[PDB]
Write a protein that binds this ligand. Structure first.
Ligand SMILES: O=c1ccn([C@H]2C[C@H](O)[C@@H](COP(=O)(O)O)O2)c(=O)[nH]1
Ligand SMILES: [Mn+2]
Ligand SMILES: [Mn+2]
Ligand SMILES: [Mn+2]
Lengths: 131, 137
């Protein structure tokens, strides 16, 4: 039952990294690190996608196992993306749920009538009052 | 209660788009998933740059100022989970394995920018093992 977002909180406590309980404006140093890790892991995803495409172009029959490096790098990207939300003190699950509500709603239409976009600002205000 | 990976599965069913087990995709699908990751990563990147520029100007950010960044981060999760789901790969099973090998880094040194590094004798996640597990069962 632990969510992936909750696992990030467990990771940051284990390594002594900042992990605020509620949304908290960050020092510039934190934003710069989050940017660096996002650039790093997304570049790794791109490299693995490129290798698969090149193998395919040459006629290689890919197996399920061939996807492991890509899957690993996609999970690393999830990890640093959740990681940014966690260091900001923002419950990733709450924000994700609102983005999903909006996307899932839109799919019942294009827009259904009475549709409302993701209101992440509202989610962040409500998270400031948690407890 | 549904996980974020399962929400992606639900979204894909809703739009009529995905395999139950790990499945090698056609090249077009790979190129499409790359495009969506690139689009959302660029929006995250631009927003972080934006915040950094405001702080450099002496502005003290409020929690409320973080809403657009939080939104873009969640969009990025959406398309990243989306990629895994279209590959037929259970995101949570892979994430759990990656998480376990991340916890084991705790004793390692830290880089100057704050990145946690790997201690001596560390061993990586076995994601190949996870894929094999999902593949058969
Ligand atoms: O400060 C850190 C260092 C590493 N990781 C995570 C994200 C990935 O899952 C992985 C990247 O580790 P490297 O292989 O790049 O060292 O560990 C973090 O979340 N924060
Ligand atoms: Mn890396
Ligand atoms: Mn990686
Ligand atoms: Mn976006």
């Amino acid at each position: 039952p632990p969510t992936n977002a909750e696992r990030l909180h467990e990771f940051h406590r284990a390594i002594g990294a900042a992990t605020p309980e509620r949304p908290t404006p960050p020092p510039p140093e934190l934003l710069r690190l989050r940017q660096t890790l996002l650039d790093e892991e997304s570049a790794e995803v791109r490299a693995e996608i490129d290798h698969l495409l090149a193998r395919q172009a040459a006629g290689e029959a890919l197996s399920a196992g061939d996807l492991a490096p890509l899957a690993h790098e996609l999970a690393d990207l999830l990890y640093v993306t959740y990681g940014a939300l966690d260091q900001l003190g923002i419950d990733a699950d709450a924000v994700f749920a609102e983005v999903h509500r909006a996307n899932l709603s839109k799919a019942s239409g294009l827009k259904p009538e009475g549709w409302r976009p993701a209101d992440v600002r509202g989610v962040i205000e409500r998270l400031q009052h948690a407890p």
